[PDB]
């Protein structure tokens, strides 16, 4: 919803609260890179002249966006610790910087890993970002976290993926919300009639 309210970046103005219009530009790119998929990124933020010329004044952010779109994964961590570090410093972001980059990692893992099926794990250290055992404990904590749809092999040193159908995960959120609202009207049903 935040990038969707940050849709325009045209009628937005030299405001009092973001006296730099470009600070608003950094905000809408930081939320948009999670909020939308590739189809939109490959139309909206890449071809907007009004969005392009203001990040043209930015050396790091223009690199930070294009490292992801141009499949430059190793420097994407380098700029990522910069953006995450400043976001850690940042007021009104500082509540959720720890939520931001843990999504950015698994999103970047999705972007590279959903291309191949037989990609090995020892390719990602030099090709993607260094540290094999870091990739081990990272990826696992995500397959273990129930996202990042693949299934890593260990003692032959390969990573295998699958494709899930939109029938079990689409079911999962429905049992979440159904049990939640059942708890809700369950509780209010306890509230009324004493």
């Amino acid at each position: 919803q935040a990038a969707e309210l940050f849709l325009d970046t045209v009628s937005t103005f030299t405001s009092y609260e973001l006296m730099d219009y470009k600070t608003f530009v950094t905000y809408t790119v930081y939320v948009s890179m999670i909020a939308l998929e590739r189809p939109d990124l490959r139309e909206k933020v890449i071809k907007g002249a009004e969005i392009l010329e203001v990040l043209h004044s930015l050396p790091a952010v223009r690199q930070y966006l294009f490292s992801l779109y141009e499949c430059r994964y190793s420097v994407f961590f380098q700029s990522l610790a910069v953006v995450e570090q400043e976001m850690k410093k940042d007021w009104l972001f500082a509540p959720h910087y720890r939520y931001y980059v843990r999504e950015m990692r698994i999103h970047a893992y999705s972007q590279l890993l959903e291309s191949y099926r037989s990609l090995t794990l020892g390719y990602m250290a030099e090709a993607f970002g260094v540290g094999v055992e870091f990739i081990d404990q990272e990826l696992s904590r995500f397959i273990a976290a129930g996202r990042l749809h693949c299934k890593i092999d260990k003692v032959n040193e390969i990573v295998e993926t699958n494709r899930p159908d939109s029938k079990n995960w689409q079911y999962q959120e429905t049992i979440k919300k159904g049990d939640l609202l059942l708890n809700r009207v369950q509780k209010l049903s306890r509230v009324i009639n004493m």
Partner: protein
């Protein structure tokens, strides 16, 4: 002279008074940032508020 109590002249707008009618009347449009309505109010040589 005992009949009418006050008579009030309404002038055509100057470069100042053309600008704020652009401001008020330009409210409900979907604009674009950076317009410089001063130039446009200079381009209109005082027709009227209509």
């Amino acid at each position: 002279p005992g009949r009418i109590d006050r008579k009030i002249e309404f002038p055509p707008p100057n470069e100042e008074a053309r600008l704020d009618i652009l401001k008020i009347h330009s409210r409900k449009m979907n604009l674009t940032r950076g317009i410089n309505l001063r130039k446009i109010a200079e381009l209109m040589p005082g027709a009227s508020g209509a």
